[PDB]
């Protein structure tokens, strides 16, 4: 439910330029306040949780290329934020199931 499958579509992007406008206006996001996407494949991101079976929030050993879509002054209209930082993923069954935050946990 709140697991890697849902985590992927909502956080795993393969482009630095995620079009927040269209992508976030789907029912998958429904234009919430913001959404931090990770520019990296699901494999190297799932590998962060490699060996973590028990639900455990872990902070990454390095920074990743993040693209954060955040709402502007207008609802469902976003500003792209391209940055590089670490992030804490809640690892369960060797897969990131919940997103904690960027920088540290």
From Swiss-Prot:
Record keyword tRNA-binding present: no
Alphabetical UniProt keywords: Disulfide bond, Endonuclease, Hydrolase, Nuclease, Pyrrolidone carboxylic acid
Family annotation (InterPro entries): RNaseA, RNaseA-like_dom_sf, RNaseA_AS, RNaseA_domain
Superkingdom of source: Eukaryota
E.C. number: 3.1.27.-
Any one GO BP annotation for this protein: defense response to Gram-positive bacterium
Active site: 11, 98
Any one GO molecular-function label of the UniProt entry: nucleic acid binding
Family designation: Belongs to the pancreatic ribonuclease family.
PANTHER family to which the protein is assigned, alphabetical: RIBONUCLEASE, RNASE 3
Function (record text): Basic protein with antiproliferative/cytotoxic activity against several tumor cell lines in vitro, as well as antitumor in vivo. It exhibits a ribonuclease-like activity against high molecular weight ribosomal RNA.
Protein known as: Protein P-30
């Amino acid at each position: 439910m709140q697991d890697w499958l849902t985590f992927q579509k909502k956080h795993i992007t393969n482009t630095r330029d995620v079009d927040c406008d269209n992508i976030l206006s789907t029912n998958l996001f429904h234009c919430k306040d913001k959404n931090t996407f990770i520019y990296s494949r699901p494999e190297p991101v799932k590998a962060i949780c490699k060996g973590i079976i028990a639900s455990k929030n872990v902070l990454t050993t390095s920074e990743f290329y993040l693209s954060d879509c955040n709402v502007t002054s207008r609802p469902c209209k976003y500003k792209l934020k391209k940055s590089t930082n670490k992030f804490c993923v809640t690892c369960e069954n060797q897969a990131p199931v919940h997103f904690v935050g960027v920088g540290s946990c």
